[PDB]
Symmetry: C3
Subunit: 99 residues, 3 copies
Amino acid sequence: GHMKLITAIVKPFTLDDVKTSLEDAGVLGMTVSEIQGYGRDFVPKVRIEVVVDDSIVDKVVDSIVRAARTGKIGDGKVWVSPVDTIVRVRTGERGHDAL
Amino acid sequence: GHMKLITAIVKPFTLDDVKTSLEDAGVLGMTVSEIQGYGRDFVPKVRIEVVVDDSIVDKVVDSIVRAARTGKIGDGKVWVSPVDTIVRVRTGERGHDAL
Amino acid sequence: GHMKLITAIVKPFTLDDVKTSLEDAGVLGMTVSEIQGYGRDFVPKVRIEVVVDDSIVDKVVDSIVRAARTGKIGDGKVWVSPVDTIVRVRTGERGHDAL
């Protein structure tokens, strides 16, 4: 309903900076996956995902963008998509309790 | 329209159990990808995805959660997101025919 | 709003053909990830993602399907899902400027 997935495709060396920015803002539950995207033909990148309430989606996106920017080609993209429902596996908590 | 993507981020050793639970319930077409998430700092996890009709989304989510739960930290998350359209590559079947 | 994510799970040897089809049609920004799906039990596949305006989503899906088809089991799936917002990291461009 109010839940959003943020997907960031960014350079691998920006991971610590993005993670720090998320954790400092109390944004928990990030995952990271390997991915290939255009750069200086493909270069290795990382796919960072978090699920957040829409109240913070704008500032979280901006924080990721700021932390991942180098000003060079291949810096990547950040997009937002709807999440209908979310469940925390361990507890069975749903919605905002699962965040 | 009525189509949903289920994404489950779960511990790698739960894969067979989740797969069995899906296949027993006639939920076909699962994919698996490598992913890293918080656990006992990141631990290896797996990303399991299926596309289903919304008629079964709730019970499929619950079946995955039950199969992947250990009661320990890092058990992961399951979320649902909308799918506008789906096409089976081999046949060009769309919508419910592609499920 | 009008933005869509196309996700294609296809056989790895079709990557060049899909990439060529996308680039020839001026569809930029594709990413590729490793994935496992059903085939001749799992076989290696690739996950190809692009973000496009909904004006071209149908023809882009069809172009990917045509390029990835072999007529054999395991050819994969292509699905479409909504994208609320997108930002190009390097520039901070949003929406259609980030495409």
